Scaffold this active site. Structure first.
Site, PDB file in Angstrom:
ATOM      1  N   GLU A  17       0.788  -1.228   0.000  1.00  0.00           N
ATOM      2  CA  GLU A  17       0.000   0.000   0.000  1.00  0.00           C
ATOM      3  C   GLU A  17       0.811   1.264   0.000  1.00  0.00           C
ATOM      4  OE1 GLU A  17      -3.151   0.345  -0.267  1.00  0.00           O
ATOM      5  OE2 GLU A  17      -3.833  -1.587   0.411  1.00  0.00           O
TER       6      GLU A  17
ATOM      7  N   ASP B  50      -6.601   6.658  -4.787  1.00  0.00           N
ATOM      8  CA  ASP B  50      -6.138   5.316  -4.895  1.00  0.00           C
ATOM      9  C   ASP B  50      -6.258   4.828  -6.314  1.00  0.00           C
ATOM     10  OD1 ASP B  50      -8.820   4.676  -5.293  1.00  0.00           O
ATOM     11  OD2 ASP B  50      -8.808   3.321  -3.522  1.00  0.00           O
TER      12      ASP B  50
END
Ligand SMILES: [Cl-]
EC number: 3.2.1.17
Length: 162
Positions: free
Chosen positions: A11, A20
């Site tokens: 991540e 994202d």
């Protein structure tokens, strides 16, 4: 290697609000803030999460706290789900982490959805599961990451994260 490290690699870490892979507002270590396309909505969720007026920026510590909360919640989510707990209980530690990774990314509901793969995992049919897991949007949209997780289920080792 452990789940925290694993996920920190998949991540990343970012201290200012960002988007994202799905174009959604996030911060820190994959902490999803909102699916709303509105940046003020995001800032609003952020200050609320942090307890202060952030102006879209947070410290490291801050991000880490979010992360801790988020791993915790993901484990617990898993254990409170009727389809998932059993899977989780049948696996070895490394593979447990793999499962946790998926929930952290796509949520309980989303992982609870992979019925067939869950079954395979449960049966300890690793290669079969790996293939089945690859037949998914997840894999198509985020292939390097999905490959890493899949290999983890397949081998029960950390080699993918080397
Ligand atoms: Cl990827």
């Amino acid at each position: 290697m452990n789940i925290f490290e694993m996920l920190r690699i998949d991540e990343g870490l970012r201290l200012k609000i960002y988007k994202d892979t799905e174009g959604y507002y996030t911060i820190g270590i994959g902490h999803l803030l909102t699916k709303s396309p509105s940046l003020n909505a995001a800032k609003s969720e952020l200050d609320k999460a942090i307890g202060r007026n952030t102006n879209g920026v947070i410290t490291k510590d801050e991000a880490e706290k979010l992360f801790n909360q988020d791993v915790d919640a993901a484990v617990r989510g898993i254990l409170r789900n009727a389809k998932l707990k059993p899977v989780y209980d049948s696996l070895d530690a490394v593979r447990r982490a793999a499962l946790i990774n998926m929930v952290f990314q796509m949520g309980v509901t989303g992982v609870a959805g992979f019925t067939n793969s869950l079954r395979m995992l449960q049966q300890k049919r690793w290669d079969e599961a790996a293939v089945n897991l690859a037949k998914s949007r997840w894999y198509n949209q985020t292939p390097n990451r999905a490959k890493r997780v899949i290999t983890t289920f397949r081998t029960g080792t950390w080699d993918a994260y080397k």
